[PDB]
Design a protein around this ligand. Structure first.
Ligand SMILES: CCCCn1c(N)c(N(C)C(=O)c2ccccc2)c(=O)[nH]c1=O
Ligand SMILES: CCCCn1c(N)c(N(C)C(=O)c2ccccc2)c(=O)[nH]c1=O
Ligand SMILES: CCCCn1c(N)c(N(C)C(=O)c2ccccc2)c(=O)[nH]c1=O
Ligand SMILES: CCCCn1c(N)c(N(C)C(=O)c2ccccc2)c(=O)[nH]c1=O
Ligand SMILES: [Cl-]
Ligand SMILES: [Cl-]
Ligand SMILES: [Cl-]
Ligand SMILES: [Cl-]
Lengths: 293, 293, 293, 293
């Protein structure tokens, strides 16, 4: 059974205005590449090739201009709009027709992940054909996120959205895997006191049915914060330190497509040509003639 | 006599693609605010209130959405397009009608400046009603810029554009002041071997007429580099270290307009309202009730 | 069979003078803690509790003052000096008596490692009772290190020390695992043209006997550079970004001792007391009453 | 009349333990050079050549090894110890004999300053032969420092030490200038509730005699924070961004001595020799054959 992906790349309201007045946050580069390249690359590593990008009406065309129909990276990209920022769960109403009867995965357009064995850690969620799979990650400021409580045996027993008195320091990350129940669960959701359709209600419903796998994303992964000006900066520094150390890029979509065998060496060469006079183009070229373990 | 300003915020070509595929560089934020805020604030400190923003046809509307007509900050902003990126000196052909018979100033949309007595250092160029005035700044990599050579008495005697063997480490910054000759000098320029109308030829012409002042911008000023992904990241770290230290913002246009008395406390309050729930709105508010020396 | 550890924390000569005039590099903190805490914590994760710290004669006492005999963290630390910086392999002559007839592991005092499953990746070297095990990591500037060449089947076939024309981009990291042959191999080493006893000759000898495992340390690990002022800075930024994101520390020795069960909750509490008024002390306290996966 | 300088580089207690367990904070490098180089360079710019370095008994020899007697940079450096960290005003009891009957200046060993016209701003305090002169600098967190309150005419009217409800955002920096009364005012001070002899009481006494000048250090100066591990890291990023941009170093003592004519080109060359194979030596060399305005 094939899994469809959704990147929700919608409005951060005015919270980061004026930095984000002219353009939506997920088109801003983090270091050497546009933000959206990072969650897209995540979906690609989880093996997902059919992807719906959801964003504001102003910006959809900009995302289209940047990513096209995906055919150049061996993907099949489609697009849809979120008129008003009415909750992350709204993705599933908007995405209903695109999901159809398949399994799905939702990733937040501004969430960056890095680490070892990231294929395998996604795999284990990607290969469960039933229920929902989310990830929990220790953070300093759990109040800002969805907080998962574990019992003494490490079983997930409550989820709470931006709690004033968090039950743990474990935050739900912005990567979610779902079966064919998600749309129907989404459709029955009531708005919350904040006026939002919450992804935590979606995930609570799977918990109450005993069908939520909460997999731990360990301290040895980077899950980076793009929610303040400060953190956005920390992230660029973080990526640039890795890339300049290794001479290898994090979350380069072309490279993921090439290594998954979704495009061949001739196609990778054609993608490199129009950027040949810069580092990124030069990087794509070098991938054709280097073995990387 | 009054001086008109031009901010050239055009195409950086593909040099910073794909970071810049969705949006032009000068809309990317540096730390808490869009890039273009920094040179605009510079022109404001130099006392210039009538400014032409030149940009690509695709992005003009994004600059317009961000900056409007300037009326809100006591300015008068106008807009023009640069269909093709044919050299910085092109700004004077495109800007001819807007300049009319006045004095002018040109600033690169991606140049950030910071330091003490910046009013005074601009002033001394802004007050010279005849000839041209540029600024020379010691850098490590002068080969990337226009290099000014001085004789033993500190007189400027040659200018050279991206010389392979620079005569000094003094680079010409991207702030230029000009009298009513610039348009005519611009009109007579032939494209260079690179296919560009070079600002260094413009400035050489003033030097050959003995009408170029080259004022030193000292080491105690920051002139920051936004030309690589690395330097852009250095620049955000730099502004954010200053701002978090001081609780005062660098190159905030509203604050410059308020302190120059181009807008009053009532108007500053109205600008603060629609961002009240973020740091930038809160910062504008606090300016109404703090004396800053 | 038990494995003994050596941290070589010797002289970086004058290369980073004057930053390092007053103190050896491995006592400088990286972000919140002294450099040496990082490789020490690495040895601890590999399960090694008996450790020889080797350093200059000036600085040994400072290392002793900082780390004591280890008894407080469940280790057994001993100390020895390297009079002159005559090569990394010299560690084994100096360490001969301390090694005795056991297996060993050598870590460079200035090498930082971070990532997921780091226990397991060390384990696989730690559990091989015969031969030598090193790690290879893709880097941009292989000329600076020991470069390992692989054949088309991914077999290690040459090692070369700071080659002018590197055969790959794979660098040998500064973590090494060795059987009872290392001392005797070390003793037979000739100085090189540079006047050094090279760790690459030690490792070449194991390769020529077919007893070198070269395990790949993947792009999903951080191996950080502390060899320039710039990289040292990049590292602090890197650690601080992780720690402030997670509210968990990288390479805190006390925490590793506590989680390996080498000290109990009462002892961890006593270590926290004298630092109670700062973040580090507060962090140790919080480890007593939080479950971390 | 001539002015004597004191750099207090004592115990920061345990506040930054364990980072600082092996070595006192003021020997840690900020980017390319030891911390203490920055305030020492400040005293040098203020024209002061006779300087007492006060530090802990354990570290004095490390400061001596780094700085010698100063003869190499045209200074005269002397050393004293501070057995217990009993307040910044203690510097005048300890320093009594060294001060003798001269004017003085006190600078905190961990305070970094940068900006334009820094000579002039010091000058104006250095030239006032009577009373005391301090500097007030706008900060975000004035509650951590001595806060100066101004009346509507910009006259200083109260000073308060770490007030919970600060009267302004103007913090007193860690650079102080004093006449021959300071010793006697110091001697009459009683310890505060915290067990410290406060520099703010010293400065309040001069205010109550009408002899305190409070000069504004403007926003266009950097006064950097070295009090947390975070800020220390910000400070290195900050210096390194300036230095890599300009190819000129901030607070290099040899360069200040050379430009003040306290050492000649032959002596500067001899200081450059023993570091010739690193950037800092190369930088000193290049100063012999470049004009810097
Ligand atoms: C399946 C090939 C994946 C190889 N790879 C990576 N594992 C990574 N790594 C280490 C990653 O952690 C990573 C992060 C986000 C999305 C995909 C991979 C990467 O950045 N680029 C890659 O080409
Ligand atoms: C009317 C004087 C404005 C005072 N002022 C500044 N001088 C600055 N300074 C210190 C600046 O360096 C600055 C830089 C570029 C353009 C304008 C000001 C500032 O950032 N914000 C300000 O409000
Ligand atoms: C065996 C407990 C190890 C748990 N742990 C870590 N895995 C790490 N991590 C993620 C590491 O990557 C790490 C790095 C160097 C040395 C030891 C662990 C850490 O920093 N601190 C820890 O307490
Ligand atoms: C004799 C004048 C020295 C010129 N000079 C400086 N002004 C500085 N500047 C810009 C500085 O801000 C500075 C800061 C602290 C102490 C001394 C100089 C410098 O870093 N190095 C220098 O050689
Ligand atoms: Cl982990
Ligand atoms: Cl200056
Ligand atoms: Cl990996
Ligand atoms: Cl100023």
């Amino acid at each position: 059974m094939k899994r469809k992906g959704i990147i929700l790349a919608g409005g951060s309201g005015t919270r980061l205005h004026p930095a984000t007045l002219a353009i939506s946050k997920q088109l801003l580069p983090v270091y050497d590449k546009p933000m959206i390249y990072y969650p897209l690359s995540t979906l690609m590593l989880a093996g997902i090739r059919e992807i719906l990008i959801i964003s504001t009406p102003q910006d959809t065309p900009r995302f289209q201009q940047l990513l096209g129909d995906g055919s150049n990276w061996g993907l099949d990209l489609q697009y849809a709009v979120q008129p008003s920022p009415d909750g992350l769960a709204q993705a599933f109403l908007i995405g209903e027709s695109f999901i159809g009867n398949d399994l799905s995965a939702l990733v937040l357009g501004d969430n960056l992940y890095y680490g070892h064995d990231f294929h395998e850690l996604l795999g284990s969620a990607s290969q469960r054909q039933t229920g929902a799979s989310v990830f929990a990650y220790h953070v300093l400021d759990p109040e800002r996120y969805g907080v998962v409580e574990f019992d003494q045996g490490g079983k997930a027993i409550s989820l709470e959205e931006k709690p004033l008195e968090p039950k743990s320091n474990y935050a739900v990350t912005g990567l979610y895997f779902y079966d064919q129940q998600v749309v129907d669960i989404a459709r029955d959701l009531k708005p919350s006191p904040r006026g939002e359709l919450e992804i935590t209600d979606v995930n609570r419903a799977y918990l109450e049915r005993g069908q939520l796998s909460v997999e731990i994303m360990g301290r040895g992964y980077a899950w980076l914060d793009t929610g303040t000006h400060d953190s956005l900066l920390e992230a660029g520094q973080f990526i640039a330190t890795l890339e300049n150390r290794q001479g290898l890029k994090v979350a380069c979509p072309e490279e993921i497509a090439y290594r998954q065998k979704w495009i061949d060496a001739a196609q990778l060469e054609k993608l490199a040509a129009p950027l040949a006079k810069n580092g990124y183009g030069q990087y794509l070229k070098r991938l054709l003639t280097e073995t990387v373990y």
